[PDB]
Amino acid sequence: MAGSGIIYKQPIYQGNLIKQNAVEQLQVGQSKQQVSALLGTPSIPDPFHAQRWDYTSTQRVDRLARTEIKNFTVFFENEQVVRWEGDYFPSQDEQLAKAAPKQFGRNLARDKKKQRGR
């Protein structure tokens, strides 16, 4: 097939795809394997009661420093997604010399808690 799909991006950044307004904005309560495949990580295939991903995951999609680091605590029933708590790169703030007037040391609108414990 004629199709050279050269997707060159290393996502080694504290709030770009991982947490600017994209993983909070998606708002999907549907599948465990879909949210972990779209981020870039395995999931939990139990057919009884497949509950939370509360783990320090890591993906070697970088080639400059080390890895894209995923401390992402996300709660599941078996497939359906309840809530997600993202301390993955835990300071989302370029306090740094950049051509952008960014007077706000947290690049994201909200958390992702709902009305439910687990």
Side-chain angles (χ1 to χ4, degrees), residues 11 17-19 23 26 33-41 53 59 61 68 70 72 74 84 88:
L17 71 91
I18 278 289
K19 53 177 193 329
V23 185
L26 65 78
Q33 64 188 301
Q34 294 291 83
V35 77
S36 211
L38 269 64
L39 285 162
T41 292
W53 161 15
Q59 188 189 6
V61 69
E68 198 272 84
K70 290 172 176 68
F72 188 71
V74 57
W84 60 86
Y88 51 0

Coordinates of all heavy atoms in Angstrom, one line a residue, residues 11 17-19 23 26 33-41 53 59 61 68 70 72 74 84 88:
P11 N 6.3 13.3 23.0 CA 5.5 14.0 24.0 C 6.1 14.1 25.5 O 5.5 13.7 26.5 CB 4.1 13.3 23.9 CG 4.5 11.9 23.6 CD 5.7 12.0 22.7
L17 N -0.5 17.0 25.3 CA -1.6 16.0 25.1 C -2.1 15.4 26.4 O -3.3 15.4 26.7 CB -1.3 15.1 23.9 CG -0.2 14.0 24.1 CD1 -0.8 12.7 24.6 CD2 0.5 13.7 22.7
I18 N -1.2 15.0 27.3 CA -1.4 14.4 28.6 C -2.3 15.2 29.6 O -3.3 14.7 30.1 CB 0.0 14.0 29.1 CG1 0.4 12.6 28.6 CG2 0.2 14.0 30.6 CD1 -0.3 11.4 29.1
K19 N -2.0 16.5 29.8 CA -3.0 17.4 30.5 C -2.8 18.9 30.2 O -2.3 19.7 31.0 CB -3.0 17.2 32.0 CG -1.7 17.1 32.8 CD -1.8 16.9 34.3 CE -0.6 17.2 35.2 NZ 0.8 16.9 34.5
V23 N -7.2 15.2 27.6 CA -7.5 14.1 28.5 C -8.6 14.4 29.6 O -9.5 13.6 29.9 CB -6.3 13.4 29.2 CG1 -6.6 12.1 30.0 CG2 -5.3 12.9 28.1
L26 N -12.0 15.1 26.9 CA -12.6 13.8 26.3 C -13.9 13.2 26.9 O -14.8 12.8 26.2 CB -11.5 12.8 26.0 CG -10.7 12.1 27.1 CD1 -11.4 11.0 27.9 CD2 -9.4 11.5 26.5
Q33 N -9.6 -0.5 28.2 CA -8.7 -0.6 27.1 C -8.7 0.5 26.1 O -7.6 0.8 25.5 CB -8.9 -2.0 26.5 CG -10.3 -2.3 25.8 CD -10.5 -3.8 25.4 OE1 -9.8 -4.3 24.6 NE2 -11.5 -4.5 25.9
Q34 N -9.8 1.2 25.8 CA -9.8 2.4 25.0 C -9.0 3.6 25.6 O -8.1 4.2 24.9 CB -11.2 2.9 24.6 CG -12.0 1.9 23.7 CD -11.5 1.8 22.3 OE1 -10.6 1.1 22.0 NE2 -12.1 2.5 21.3
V35 N -9.3 4.1 26.8 CA -8.5 5.1 27.5 C -7.0 4.8 27.7 O -6.1 5.7 27.4 CB -9.2 5.7 28.7 CG1 -9.2 4.8 30.0 CG2 -8.7 7.1 29.1
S36 N -6.6 3.6 28.1 CA -5.2 3.2 28.2 C -4.5 3.0 26.8 O -3.3 3.4 26.7 CB -5.1 1.9 29.0 OG -3.8 1.9 29.7
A37 N -5.1 2.5 25.7 CA -4.6 2.5 24.4 C -4.4 3.9 23.7 O -3.4 4.2 23.1 CB -5.5 1.6 23.5
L38 N -5.4 4.8 23.9 CA -5.2 6.3 23.5 C -4.1 7.1 24.2 O -3.4 7.8 23.6 CB -6.6 7.0 23.6 CG -7.5 6.9 22.3 CD1 -7.9 5.5 21.8 CD2 -8.7 7.8 22.5
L39 N -4.0 6.9 25.6 CA -2.8 7.4 26.3 C -1.5 6.7 25.9 O -0.4 7.4 25.8 CB -3.1 7.3 27.8 CG -4.1 8.4 28.4 CD1 -4.7 7.9 29.7 CD2 -3.3 9.7 28.5
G40 N -1.5 5.4 25.8 CA -0.3 4.6 25.5 C 0.3 3.7 26.6 O 1.3 4.0 27.2
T41 N -0.5 2.7 27.0 CA -0.3 1.8 28.2 C -1.2 0.6 28.1 O -2.3 0.7 27.6 CB -0.5 2.7 29.5 OG1 0.5 3.7 29.6 CG2 -0.5 2.0 30.8
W53 N -7.1 1.4 37.4 CA -5.6 1.6 37.1 C -5.1 2.7 38.0 O -5.1 3.8 37.7 CB -5.5 1.9 35.5 CG -4.3 2.5 34.9 CD1 -2.9 2.7 35.4 CD2 -4.2 3.2 33.7 NE1 -2.1 3.4 34.5 CE2 -2.9 3.8 33.5 CE3 -5.3 3.5 32.7 CZ2 -2.7 4.6 32.3 CZ3 -5.0 4.3 31.6 CH2 -3.7 4.8 31.4
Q59 N 6.1 4.9 29.3 CA 6.1 4.6 27.9 C 7.4 5.3 27.3 O 7.6 6.5 27.3 CB 4.9 5.2 27.2 CG 4.7 4.8 25.7 CD 3.5 5.5 25.0 OE1 2.8 6.4 25.5 NE2 3.2 5.1 23.8
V61 N 8.1 6.4 24.3 CA 7.9 7.3 23.2 C 8.8 8.6 23.0 O 8.9 9.1 21.9 CB 6.3 7.6 23.2 CG1 5.8 8.5 24.3 CG2 5.8 8.2 21.8
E68 N 7.9 9.0 28.6 CA 6.6 9.7 29.0 C 6.0 9.0 30.2 O 5.5 7.9 30.2 CB 5.8 9.8 27.7 CG 4.6 10.9 27.8 CD 3.3 10.4 28.3 OE1 3.1 10.4 29.6 OE2 2.4 10.0 27.5
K70 N 3.5 8.2 33.4 CA 2.1 8.1 33.6 C 1.7 7.6 35.0 O 1.2 6.5 35.2 CB 1.4 7.2 32.5 CG 1.4 7.8 31.1 CD 1.0 6.7 30.1 CE 0.8 7.1 28.6 NZ 2.1 7.4 28.0
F72 N -1.3 7.9 36.6 CA -2.7 8.2 36.2 C -3.7 7.3 37.0 O -3.8 6.1 36.6 CB -2.8 8.1 34.7 CG -4.2 8.6 34.1 CD1 -4.6 9.9 34.1 CD2 -5.0 7.6 33.5 CE1 -5.7 10.3 33.4 CE2 -6.2 8.0 32.8 CZ -6.5 9.4 32.8
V74 N -7.1 6.0 37.5 CA -8.4 6.0 36.8 C -9.2 4.8 37.3 O -8.8 3.7 37.3 CB -8.2 6.2 35.3 CG1 -7.3 5.2 34.6 CG2 -9.6 6.2 34.6
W84 N -10.9 10.1 37.1 CA -9.5 10.0 36.8 C -8.7 11.2 37.4 O -9.0 12.4 37.3 CB -9.2 9.9 35.3 CG -9.6 10.9 34.2 CD1 -9.0 12.1 33.8 CD2 -10.7 10.7 33.3 NE1 -9.7 12.7 32.8 CE2 -10.7 11.9 32.5 CE3 -11.6 9.7 33.1 CZ2 -11.7 12.0 31.5 CZ3 -12.6 9.8 32.1 CH2 -12.6 10.9 31.3
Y88 N 0.5 12.9 36.5 CA 1.5 12.4 35.5 C 2.3 13.6 34.9 O 1.7 14.4 34.2 CB 0.7 11.5 34.5 CG -0.5 11.9 33.7 CD1 -1.3 13.1 33.9 CD2 -1.0 11.0 32.8 CE1 -2.4 13.4 33.2 CE2 -2.2 11.2 32.1 CZ -2.9 12.4 32.3 OH -4.0 12.7 31.5

